Amino acid sequence: TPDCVTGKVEYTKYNDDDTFTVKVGDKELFTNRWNLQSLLLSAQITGMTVTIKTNACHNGGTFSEVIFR
Amino acid sequence: TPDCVTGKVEYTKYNDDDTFTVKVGDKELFTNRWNLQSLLLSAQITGMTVTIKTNACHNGGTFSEVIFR
Amino acid sequence: TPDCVTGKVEYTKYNDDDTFTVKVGDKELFTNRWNLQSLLLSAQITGMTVTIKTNACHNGGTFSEVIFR
Amino acid sequence: TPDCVTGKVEYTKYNDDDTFTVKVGDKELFTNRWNLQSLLLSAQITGMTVTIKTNACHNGGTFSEVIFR
Amino acid sequence: TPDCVTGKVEYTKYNDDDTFTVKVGDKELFTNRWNLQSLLLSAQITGMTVTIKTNACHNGGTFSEVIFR
Numbered sequence: 001t002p003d004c005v006t007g008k009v010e011y012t013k014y015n016d017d018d019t020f021t022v023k024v025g026d027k028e029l030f031t032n033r034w035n036l037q038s039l040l041l042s043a044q045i046t047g048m049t050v051t052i053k054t055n056a057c058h059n060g061g062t063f064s065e066v067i068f069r
Numbered sequence: 070t071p072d073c074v075t076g077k078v079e080y081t082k083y084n085d086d087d088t089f090t091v092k093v094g095d096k097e098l099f100t101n102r103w104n105l106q107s108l109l110l111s112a113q114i115t116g117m118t119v120t121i122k123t124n125a126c127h128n129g130g131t132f133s134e135v136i137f138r
Numbered sequence: 139t140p141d142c143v144t145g146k147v148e149y150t151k152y153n154d155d156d157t158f159t160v161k162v163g164d165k166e167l168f169t170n171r172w173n174l175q176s177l178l179l180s181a182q183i184t185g186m187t188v189t190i191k192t193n194a195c196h197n198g199g200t201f202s203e204v205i206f207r
Numbered sequence: 208t209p210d211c212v213t214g215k216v217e218y219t220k221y222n223d224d225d226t227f228t229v230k231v232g233d234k235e236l237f238t239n240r241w242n243l244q245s246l247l248l249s250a251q252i253t254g255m256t257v258t259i260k261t262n263a264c265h266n267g268g269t270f271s272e273v274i275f276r
Numbered sequence: 277t278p279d280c281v282t283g284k285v286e287y288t289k290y291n292d293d294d295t296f297t298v299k300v301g302d303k304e305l306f307t308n309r310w311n312l313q314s315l316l317l318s319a320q321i322t323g324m325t326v327t328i329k330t331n332a333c334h335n336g337g338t339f340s341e342v343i344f345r
């Protein structure tokens with residue numbers, strides 16, 4: 001899967017349909033994987049750098065692959 | 070969904086019916102989304118600023134959308 | 139539901155039947171809500187003040203309502 | 208249930224059958240309660256003193272009761 | 277199960293199929309145990325030394341046993 005964005009998590013958003021939105025770099029992407037919610041929030045709080053991999057690399061795109069550094 | 074309140078979490082409450090209550094700003098709101106429980110407590114502990122979006126923007130109103138800044 | 143005890147969490151105990159015991163103030167109370175286990179341990183570790191609301195306000199009594207401050 | 212060991216968590220081990228092993232004092236014990244996994248790791252990380260209560264108080268013995276202080 | 281690698285977690289990766297990848301030492305290994313996801317991230321954040329035991333000790337190999345020191 002191609003890299004989409006790398007950077008710190010600016011903010012996260014819990015959505016009405018239980019999906020989770022994240023803003024990294026200049027893209028706002030979302031995931032339907034529930035396991036990622038607490039993982040992404042921890043990364044936001046501790047200031048980790050994440051790389052999100054997805055073919056839908058555009059605002060509103062989905063992802064399910066993340067690298068925590 | 071319109072913004073309702075923005076601020077730090079003053080306190081949280083675990084309810085008898087397994088719902089979760091949060092006090093942000095001047096509104097006391099609750100959610101039935103179990104996933105939000107640990108996320109909201111983490112936000113409380115680390116002192117994050119949260120934005121709750123909901124049409125039921127009044128005390129005792131419900132929500133399921135939260136932005137963690 | 140009436141307030142029972144308020145104070146820091148002195149200690150927590152995981153029970154053989156998967157219920158969770160907590161000692162706040164002078165009372166030792168237990169809950170069968172699994173969601174409360176990690177929340178209460180976090181409150182103990184971070185030194186939060188909790189308020190437990192219950193009608194069974196006596197040693198060995200049950201609760202399912204907690205305010206985290 | 209009788210006290211078995213008291214002290215800090217020296218190390219923990221995730222096992223192949225999804226049980227969790229903990230080394231407290233001079234005993235290595237394990238539990239099959241999934242709820243205890245994150246609780247025990249938190250206790251290891253923060254340096255809490257734990258008391259494990261069990262009748263099988265010997266290396267390789269099982270437990271399901273823990274006191275966190 | 278024989279020791280494979282020992283060291284700090286360089287990075288973790290959430291995979292498309294809900295498995296979890298970890299890089300320790302010079303090996304990149306993955307696990308299908310969901311319970312290990314938050315445990316491993318906590319280990320990465322706090323800088324613990326972990327020992328991964330597995331017979332599939334090579335890049336892309338699987339594991340389900342971890343010692344958290």
Ligand SMILES: OC[C@H]1O[C@H](O[C@@H]2[C@H](O)[C@@H](O)[C@H](O[C@H]3[C@H](O)[C@@H](O)[C@H](O)O[C@@H]3CO)O[C@@H]2CO)[C@H](O)[C@@H](O)[C@H]1O
Nearest residue numbers: 017018019031032033034035036037064292293294310
């Ligand atoms: O991250 C793990 C998981 O996330 C998404 O699944 C969510 C829950 O983890 C999963 O347990 C839940 O399953 C539903 C079933 O769809 C439903 O048929 C059954 O009655 O109730 C359970 C409730 O637990 O579904 C949610 C998402 O809707 C994701 O879909 C899944 O592939 C996996 O990544």
Ligand SMILES: OC[C@H]1O[C@H](O[C@@H]2[C@H](O)[C@@H](O)[C@H](O[C@H]3[C@H](O)[C@@H](O)[C@H](O)O[C@@H]3CO)O[C@@H]2CO)[C@H](O)[C@@H](O)[C@H]1O
Nearest residue numbers: 016017018034086087088100101102103104105106133
């Ligand atoms: O945020 C996650 C989830 O929260 C709410 O659902 C809760 C649990 O997450 C969910 O697993 C649970 O599903 C149970 C039902 O309670 C039960 O009545 C049925 O028989 O079995 C399922 C599967 O275990 O439900 C609780 C809420 O009571 C929320 O409702 C849900 O939409 C979702 O946001």
Ligand SMILES: OC[C@H]1O[C@H](O[C@@H]2[C@H](O)[C@@H](O)[C@H](O[C@H]3[C@H](O)[C@@H](O)[C@H](O)O[C@@H]3CO)O[C@@H]2CO)[C@H](O)[C@@H](O)[C@H]1O
Nearest residue numbers: 085086087088103155156169170171172173174175202
């Ligand atoms: O605090 C939330 C929850 O705590 C208690 O339920 C426990 C778990 O939280 C819950 O997920 C688990 O659900 C089981 C139930 O045992 C069973 O009734 C159902 O059919 O299957 C699901 C698993 O798929 O149950 C445990 C306790 O057994 C508490 O019982 C519950 O009311 C609620 O407060």
Ligand SMILES: OC[C@H]1O[C@H](O[C@@H]2[C@H](O)[C@@H](O)[C@H](O[C@H]3[C@H](O)[C@@H](O)[C@H](O)O[C@@H]3CO)O[C@@H]2CO)[C@H](O)[C@@H](O)[C@H]1O
Nearest residue numbers: 154155156157172224225238239240241242243244271
């Ligand atoms: O942590 C207390 C609990 O530990 C053991 O149960 C484990 C999980 O806690 C429990 O949720 C799980 O049961 C779930 C599984 O997802 C499902 O596959 C099964 O059919 O029932 C529910 C459905 O959601 O089971 C694991 C262990 O396999 C322990 O067995 C249990 O008695 C209790 O002490």
Ligand SMILES: OC[C@H]1O[C@H](O[C@@H]2[C@H](O)[C@@H](O)[C@H](O[C@H]3[C@H](O)[C@@H](O)[C@H](O)O[C@@H]3CO)O[C@@H]2CO)[C@H](O)[C@@H](O)[C@H]1O
Nearest residue numbers: 223224225241293294295307308309310311312313340
């Ligand atoms: O680490 C615990 C667990 O990890 C893996 O299981 C995952 C979930 O923990 C488990 O609850 C989930 O079980 C699903 C089944 O896949 C589904 O077919 C059935 O209908 O419902 C249950 C939910 O109650 O499965 C995922 C992995 O797909 C691992 O597989 C398992 O052995 C155990 O280590």
Ligand SMILES: OC[C@H]1O[C@H](O[C@@H]2[C@H](O)[C@@H](O)[C@H](O[C@H]3[C@H](O)[C@@H](O)[C@H](O)O[C@@H]3CO)O[C@@H]2CO)[C@H](O)[C@@H](O)[C@H]1O
Nearest residue numbers: 289291292293295296297298304305306335336337338
């Ligand atoms: O080494 C880290 C590696 O972990 C994950 O990959 C795992 C195996 O290493 C990999 O060989 C395996 O590949 C599967 C494909 O997912 C599947 O589409 C194809 O049909 O079969 C191959 C071979 O069995 O996938 C597992 C994970 O399930 C991770 O996905 C990978 O990016 C990398 O981090």
